[PDB]
Structures are given as structure tokens and as C-alpha cells.
């Protein structure tokens, strides 16, 4: 459980890619 924070990290970075074009739907609401 110890390692697995830092390997959720890297799959919050690229998370973020996904969330940038979800950033710009959230205004067309």
C-alpha cells in the first residue's frame, strides 16, 4: 500500500489529460 500512492500519482498526471477537455464541457454547461 506504501508504493501504491506513488504509482496513483502517475496515473493522476495523466488523468489530468483527460479532465483538460472535460475543464472546457464544464463551462459549456
Known sequence: KKKL???LV???????MMLLHFTIQQRKK
Open 5 to 7: 500512492g506513488f504509482f
Open 10 to 16: 502517475t496515473f493522476l498526471f495523466i488523468w489530468g
